[PDB]
Amino acid sequence: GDVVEAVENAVARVADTIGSGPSNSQAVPALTAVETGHTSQVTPSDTVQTRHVKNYHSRSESSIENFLSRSACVYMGEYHTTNSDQTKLFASWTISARRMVQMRRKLEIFTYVRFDVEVTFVITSKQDQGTQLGQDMPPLTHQIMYIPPGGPIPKSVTDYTWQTSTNPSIFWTEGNAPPRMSIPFISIGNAYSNFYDGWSHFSQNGVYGYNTLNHMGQIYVRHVNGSSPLPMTSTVRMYFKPKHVKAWVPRPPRLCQYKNASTVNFSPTDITDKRNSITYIPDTVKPDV
Amino acid sequence: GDVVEAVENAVARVADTIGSGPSNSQAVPALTAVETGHTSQVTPSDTVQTRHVKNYHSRSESSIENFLSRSACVYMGEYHTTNSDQTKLFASWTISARRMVQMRRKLEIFTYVRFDVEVTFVITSKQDQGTQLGQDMPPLTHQIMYIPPGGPIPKSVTDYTWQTSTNPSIFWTEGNAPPRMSIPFISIGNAYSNFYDGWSHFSQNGVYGYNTLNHMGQIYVRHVNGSSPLPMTSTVRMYFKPKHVKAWVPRPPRLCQYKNASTVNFSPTDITDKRNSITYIPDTVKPDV
Amino acid sequence: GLPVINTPGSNQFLTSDDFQSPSAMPQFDVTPELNIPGEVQNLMEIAEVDSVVPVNNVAGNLETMDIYRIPVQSGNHQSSQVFGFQVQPGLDGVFKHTLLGEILNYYAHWSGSIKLTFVFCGSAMATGKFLLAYAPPGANAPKSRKDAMLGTHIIWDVGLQSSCVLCIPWISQTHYRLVQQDEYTSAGNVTCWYQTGIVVPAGTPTSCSIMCFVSACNDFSVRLLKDTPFIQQAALLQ
Amino acid sequence: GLPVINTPGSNQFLTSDDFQSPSAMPQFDVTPELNIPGEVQNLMEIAEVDSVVPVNNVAGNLETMDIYRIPVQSGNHQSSQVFGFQVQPGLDGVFKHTLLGEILNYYAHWSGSIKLTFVFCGSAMATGKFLLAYAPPGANAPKSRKDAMLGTHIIWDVGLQSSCVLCIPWISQTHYRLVQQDEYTSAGNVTCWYQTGIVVPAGTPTSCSIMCFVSACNDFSVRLLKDTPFIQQAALLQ
Amino acid sequence: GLPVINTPGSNQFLTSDDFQSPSAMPQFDVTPELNIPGEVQNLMEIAEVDSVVPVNNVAGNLETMDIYRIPVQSGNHQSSQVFGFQVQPGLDGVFKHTLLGEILNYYAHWSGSIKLTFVFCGSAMATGKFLLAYAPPGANAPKSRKDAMLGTHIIWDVGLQSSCVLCIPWISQTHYRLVQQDEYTSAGNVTCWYQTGIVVPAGTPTSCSIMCFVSACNDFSVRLLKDTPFIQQAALLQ
Amino acid sequence: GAQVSTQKTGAHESIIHYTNINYYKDAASNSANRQDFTQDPGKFTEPVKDIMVKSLPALN
Amino acid sequence: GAQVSTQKTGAHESIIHYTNINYYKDAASNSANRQDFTQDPGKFTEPVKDIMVKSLPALN
Amino acid sequence: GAQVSTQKTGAHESIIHYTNINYYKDAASNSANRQDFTQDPGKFTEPVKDIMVKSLPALN
Amino acid sequence: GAQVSTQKTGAHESIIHYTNINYYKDAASNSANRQDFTQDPGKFTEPVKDIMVKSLPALN
Amino acid sequence: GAQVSTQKTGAHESIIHYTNINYYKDAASNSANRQDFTQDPGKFTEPVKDIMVKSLPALN
């Protein structure tokens, strides 16, 4: 069907257990050759006598759409209402889903993915700690601005750049529902690439990996009231919920912890946990030993 | 019909009183044998002369759905905006309807029940008592997070765990309508079991009763502004309204008071209230004695 | 933007509201329904079932199987009334903790006829006739068999049919009575008398017990949900 | 203005909600879709693929290719059990980091039959028969071949067909088991024994390895999404 | 009151939103439309028009009509390359302030073939053949006519047809290139060489100028609106 | 694609109905079935094999 | 111009559907396709040319 | 009295349309015509009387 | 499933009607019946058996 | 039971109409009649009995 539509029937039922009786033949379903690279299609009924079971179990929650389509924090940063640093007056990062692991490991199960994204922002502010704490600051209004690669970059909370005549921006005031919007599949290519065993330069050097393929611009966020007698500080959290998904060439789930955002680097890590012996099976069922 | 649908006709009329006259026969409706375990089906017209009455009375309000389908407080707890205890900075419990009696006695009238649940939360905050009381705290925003059995558990108000990439969470700000959501029939079994005359271990020991069957995870709730110059404290109240109900094998209503949440334990209690003698009937109708 | 006006009520939380709400678990596959025996559908199904009435709820019997036994005996005791009680199904001690009573206590209004089944538990060689009477309100409880027989009554003959049913027809000025009954919604009393003493042959016990069961007839209903007075707590971990 | 009432839930942000939202890029012309090989559609497609089980996850093998080799040998070792392990696909070390295991860890419930494929990697001149048994819960692990053969099992004859499949049929009181398994949702164990020792001609190695692959059958499904225990971080720039 | 839930986004002001809004001038009678010549409908109509390329954008020509003249002459200069430039329509000085360039700068992505028209402005008695070459990326700019002729090229014969068109076909790994071009979206270069020198009779100037025009072909499009780097201000009353 | 059904009758012996539309993808989100009124006392008051006609003795 | 399709079935073995209308001009604005459930394990579990009947040897 | 037209196609090669109703009395209140895509380069690139076939000389 | 009826006429001797839909399950929730205008003075002004024609004496 | 009529034409020489529904029981609640454009100058500019043809003298 069309993977852009918000409706589409059909139950995802698993297989019924076919009733099976005794057998004496040359059929040898339980004997295969794993060398071929084929995974055996044996079901219980091929190796034991089974009753018939009408199975209603469905695989609805393990569909790629339902697995990825849940908002995940992909970034968080702070900025102050007032400070001497100018820089600390606004936040900015470079769009990517590589800075928070949960989301990253989920996406990295697939080599390529294509989708629209529902972005939701959760912004909070707190009054900074100090000796004098009394003030009456009106509601804070924030501005989130997206700068596609190549656009002029803000240099202060009051730069002309925040005019957003063309960059898309969101103005939001505290106390209301978190801001939200959909972004289409924005790639230069036919699918976003999660891994790239390649370089940026033709001479097989330059930058290696995911980074050379990125370049989706950055986000800048600042307060608009711009002031507060006493210092305050806000935290902006951004969430991604992919929707209308397509994925290709699955790969094993990341086993070693991530070391940084630009690389696939890792330290050698254990295949799994140890146990006492290759025959160790704990004894449950005892008058409690 | 389908007990999942929010509409379905038909009046629940009680029985009309059939007009009855004088009788002299071998019919002996008023003489039965209670030993059989059968409840007599005698109506007034079988034992006295009755007029005919077209009765319009309906049993609508005693249908299982209308009896259980009213939000009930099933839990309440507190958490502070600021404290030295870390622990006191967030609330957490284990889902069950066994900690508030009203709801519990209602459910326990049935051995098994199956239903969806409408959960509504009422959250309130108060400023703690102290010598200095002046501050200007912006609106408090809370986070309620559900942790299915097996999920990582928060260890502080700032644990990575609150990222909820997958657990479902609700963010809500004070002053707005109480938060609410529906939860489907979530049991591992075919009906939630209110009583279990059994054990957790196969050797007939371990934990006895309701508890071994529970395990529906827990709820954690914390403030998100995370601060307040002066101490404040919030109380979270959770309400359950079962809906789309089905119930089986009714049992007598709990007679003795409940002693704790994990057991059916009780102290011997009176069958009913005493009165003077087996013939005592107070005299009303007197020029006031 | 479509024009809108919020009406009083907006943003309130009414315990007994009935609205749609987002599911926190989109597409959850619920476990298949299983056909369990004994499905209940209306609390009246429970109230229609007989349960034993603690008629002898006298001080000292409150925690012993006696509260359920009505004492009756051989010899001359005609003047002696066997028992009597008010007809306040949801309020008087005799009924309130009954199956019918516990149910009535979750409501504020009731209406309908009631069945009182009496079962004789003496030896098979025992014999006797009793007069079971129900008096609608307006006068004080009959003080003699003469007065009692002027009201609704059955004369019960003990025999192979161990049980007899006294049905209390609904007679009231109003269609409903308060479960928390007052004089305005009075329902009268039922009293019982020896119609002709208990006779017995030699070698058999000279005294036995009669038990009493109560249940609702099919014209019975209840209204106006409320909490029960019967359950409470001083703190959580309930 | 059309009259409206806001219901509880208004203005909340539920991670798993599912609503329409304005696009910040009106009329953006997305790049054409390209037909890439290997499209995945349901995580179960991955769980249905065999992956190598680290059966020999003994201290000291945690980072060496041995953890994947089950040692078996020539000579008399019948009394000696070849291996054994619990059937907790999402929890026990033997399975948790498997293709099937990693997937199960993103869910809280599972159900279905499992395929265990065993492949013999000795020389072609090697010979032998093994007994592969699965015991449903309720007793402790068989301690001898006698006890093991009383449960579900195949007798595997090493031959030209290098591999043998032991299928673990779904036998459970409940339709589902916790991936984070407890005793209540126990699934039993599988153990392996020499049915008739490994015989070999002269000039060939007297000991070899058997490997074990796991994969889900077609009656397998999972429910109730949750985060994996397996990945974490102490700070951003992740 | 009709029940409603506000979704994230409520009350925000998105620059590129697209909603209905009340008119502050109900029933205003707008003045009749007039059919003016030259109606524009898509900025591409402008980019499809030739404009003069400042190929000779060398220091010192930035404010003189020379920047538009490519110098060419009589005599032996074969080894001498006539000119060369990168193909970065929205970025390199040679193109950015061109009609096509100014337009590209209001967008972040471009795709399509480009037309380069060269017009000879020497005397009519002048003669000559040039080689116009375009090299797709991957190697450095041809350093000789030998190397240049291995790529896409036309051999232009000066004659009555004063102009010759070198069309740069779209050859790219991706469907689009950044207007703010990087090495990843490189597009190559075009260089020009004497194919056979400029010959001239006596009494005529021995050197002349060739001009170069650029315009988009009909397979050209642009995406992703953004502001131009080219215009700015320090304060209002602009 | 909506449903119209009748309202529970109030204060008097066509405008006595309401309309409803479901806006959510899960049945759990729907409102309660307050209008379904079936009944089967029998399971409990009379679970005897051998039908008791009761107008007849019940023993004998 | 709306669409009606069925809801995912919940707590029981016509009112089991919902209606939806799209209010935005871009497909990106639409809700997720949580109801599409196709499947093709084959790409991965059995990418062998020469069909393996497996009830037969697999070699020989 | 509403209008249904198609959405601009997104992330993939019936639910690809939207519905709109105008609530105001003035055309000025309506949303933008972002879906009209005509074109006529000719006014500008080729405003010559005497059609230039260009595959032919253009002079001569 | 809505109802259309006429409005009470105002400031002048098709657009003189309104539409209504009931959103609640109980008749009590409905709006008032401000449009019902019956009348029967007789119960009170003339409750005499024996019809008084009054244009005739009334006695005699 | 709604009404569709045309919008006042704006900035250009089917989507030029709007729809309206009345939600109140009194005509007073309705919006203004900004679209009614009758005219009768005569009452004032020419209230003479004896029709003045004016192209003729007007006296004589």
PDB file of C-alpha atoms in Angstrom, chain E residues 28 47 54 57 60 77 85 102 106 110 112 121 133 144 146 156 159 171 177 179 189 195 203 211 215 225 229:
ATOM      1  CA  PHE E  28     -14.176  46.346   0.660  1.00  0.00           C
ATOM      2  CA  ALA E  47      16.260  32.049 -14.221  1.00  0.00           C
ATOM      3  CA  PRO E  54      31.253  38.413 -15.064  1.00  0.00           C
ATOM      4  CA  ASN E  57      36.111  39.029 -12.150  1.00  0.00           C
ATOM      5  CA  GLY E  60      40.620  45.777 -10.588  1.00  0.00           C
ATOM      6  CA  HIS E  77      48.584  31.199 -27.939  1.00  0.00           C
ATOM      7  CA  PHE E  85      35.704  28.495 -13.795  1.00  0.00           C
ATOM      8  CA  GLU E 102      20.495  35.742  -7.388  1.00  0.00           C
ATOM      9  CA  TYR E 106      16.830  32.415  -2.047  1.00  0.00           C
ATOM     10  CA  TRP E 110      19.122  23.168  -7.010  1.00  0.00           C
ATOM     11  CA  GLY E 112      19.151  20.921 -13.657  1.00  0.00           C
ATOM     12  CA  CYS E 121      32.485  40.340 -30.676  1.00  0.00           C
ATOM     13  CA  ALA E 133      34.805  21.833 -22.338  1.00  0.00           C
ATOM     14  CA  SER E 144      45.861  21.275 -21.343  1.00  0.00           C
ATOM     15  CA  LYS E 146      44.468  17.298 -24.514  1.00  0.00           C
ATOM     16  CA  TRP E 156      32.863  26.396 -31.884  1.00  0.00           C
ATOM     17  CA  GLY E 159      31.061  32.606 -38.414  1.00  0.00           C
ATOM     18  CA  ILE E 171      25.405  14.669 -14.102  1.00  0.00           C
ATOM     19  CA  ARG E 177      23.060  19.898  -5.067  1.00  0.00           C
ATOM     20  CA  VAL E 179      23.301  26.119  -3.632  1.00  0.00           C
ATOM     21  CA  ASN E 189      34.425  22.980 -14.240  1.00  0.00           C
ATOM     22  CA  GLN E 195      41.213  24.859 -31.109  1.00  0.00           C
ATOM     23  CA  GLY E 203      43.636  46.473 -41.136  1.00  0.00           C
ATOM     24  CA  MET E 211      31.079  37.465 -23.803  1.00  0.00           C
ATOM     25  CA  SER E 215      20.596  30.563 -18.115  1.00  0.00           C
ATOM     26  CA  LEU E 225      13.337  28.549   0.690  1.00  0.00           C
ATOM     27  CA  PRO E 229      23.162  36.341   2.204  1.00  0.00           C
TER      28      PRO E 229
END
